[PDB]
Amino acid sequence: MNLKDSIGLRIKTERERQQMSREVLCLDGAELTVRQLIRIEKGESLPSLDRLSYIAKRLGKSMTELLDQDNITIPDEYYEMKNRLIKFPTYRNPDRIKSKLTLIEEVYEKFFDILPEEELLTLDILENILSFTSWEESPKVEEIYEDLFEQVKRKRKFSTNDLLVIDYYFFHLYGRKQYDKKLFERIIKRVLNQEIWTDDVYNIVLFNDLMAIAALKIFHNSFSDFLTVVDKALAVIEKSQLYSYKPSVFVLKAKYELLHKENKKEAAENYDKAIVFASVLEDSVLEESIKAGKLADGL
Numbered sequence: 001m002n003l004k005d006s007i008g009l010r011i012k013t014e015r016e017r018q019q020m021s022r023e024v025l026c027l028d029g030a031e032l033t034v035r036q037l038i039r040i041e042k043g044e045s046l047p048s049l050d051r052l053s054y055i056a057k058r059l060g061k062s063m064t065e066l067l068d069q070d071n072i073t074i075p076d077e078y079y080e081m082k083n084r085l086i087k088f089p090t091y092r093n094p095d096r097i098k099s100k101l102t103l104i105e106e107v108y109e110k111f112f113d114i115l116p117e118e119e120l121l122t123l124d125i126l127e128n129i130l131s132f133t134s135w136e137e138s139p140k141v142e143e144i145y146e147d148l149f150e151q152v153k154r155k156r157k158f159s160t161n162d163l164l165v166i167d168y169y170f171f172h173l174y175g176r177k178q179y180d181k182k183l184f185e186r187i188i189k190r191v192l193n194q195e196i197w198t199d200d201v202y203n204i205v206l207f208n209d210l211m212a213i214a215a216l217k218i219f220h221n222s223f224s225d226f227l228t229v230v231d232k233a234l235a236v237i238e239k240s241q242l243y244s245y246k247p248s249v250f251v252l253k254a255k256y257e258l259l260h261k262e263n264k265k266e267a268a269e270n271y272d273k274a275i276v277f278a279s280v281l282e283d284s285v286l287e288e289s290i291k292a293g294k295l296a297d298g299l
Contacts, residue, residue, distance in 0.1 A: 002113055005043035006070055007052075012041035014059050014066075025058045030154055033147040039117065046072065048116035074114055081107045082122075083201045086160075089244070090130070091285075101130055121148060122161050125168045135172055153183065156190055163205045166191065170212040175219075188213055192228055196239045203240040207233060214252050223260040230256070244281060247290055250274035258297055268299040 015025060022034045031054045039045035040055075047055065052072070056063045085103040090096040108115075108123045124141045127133070135142055145168055152158070152165045166187060173179050191209055210233045217226055233249045236242065254270035257263045271294040278287035 002043070003070055003072070004040075004046045004113070006068075007047065007066065007072070008041045008043040010066055010068065011037075011047075011055055011059075014061060015041075018059065020059075025055070027058075029147070030151060033150065035143070035147055036117065039144075045117035045120075046115065048118050051116070072114070072116075074119075075111070078107065078111045078115070078119075081110075082119075085126075086201050086204055091244075097130055101127060104130075117144060118148065118161055121145060122164050125164050125171075129167065129171050135168070153187065156193070158190070158194055160199075160202045160205050163191070163194075163202070163209050167205070167209050167212060170209065170216065173216055179220075181222075184216070188225065188229075192225065192232055196232075196235055198239065200240045203236045204242070207236045207240075207242060207245065210236070211248065211252075218255055218259065221259070223256060226252075226256050226260065244283065244286070247274035247278045247281075247286060250277065251290060251293060254294075254297075254299075258299070264299060267297070268294070271297075271299060 015022075022037050026032045026034050026037055032051055036045070036051070037055075040047050040051070049072070052063055052066060056066050059066075081103070085100060085107065088096075088100050088103065090100055104123050104127050108120065108127075112120070121141065121144050124138070125145070128135065128138055128141065135145075145165065148165050149169055152162045155162060158166065169187065173184070191206070191213065194206060196203060196206070210229050214226065214229050214233070217223060217229070230249060230252050233252070234246070237246050237249065250270050250273045254267040254274070257270060258267035261267075271290065274290045275287055275294070278290055
């Protein structure tokens, strides 16, 4: 018996004492789904502060009562390590990808017993995306993702964790000819409406979501709001000083000019801005990769 078992049993015992069904407790599932509540009551998942507060309100209990002497405090070292690994750029370098995956597993194992389901899923998302693991081969992660995405897709203000769930949604769309276009537009619009503050962790995750959006729009040949995506990516770069990512945004503007405007001159000029920027950064690997892209696009 661990922390998850003790809290889950307490919640289940009180829910059953009140003769309350899971469906009644969870209402429309916006804050807690039935499967999420089942996993909590079985001791498979720990409730986050937010889920625990919701459950206590529905049961007419205080969080203190539901906790008794149990302590769900997440050590600050967890967030320190999670933030460090989100700010750890791979640059598509396989050695750095492997190091980042090692960091993810380190934090996952060290804090497993004290993390709520949402945090563990966040780590599983990063591992699967970075290792290019098919979501179809990860069925337990997928079941948990499904309900978190049903909750995120109803929101208009996204936390860092929400943006990572959204990143895993974009991962489902990679290379997929068939997709729900109305859902994608809805998600796109809300991501573009997030405010950019001084949270570098948030901004990096937001930036990567914008790049995923841009890449899917090119793939689907759907360029509505594409310049909005470009402008928001540039604003994130400025707020968090993410200058090594700026050439990739100039390359996005080139694709827009080349594929949507069919303006080869302005596409070439945007490629040249990316190349000069990479060169001034003295990032030769990036510079040559962009020069190859310019030539491969016939410019």
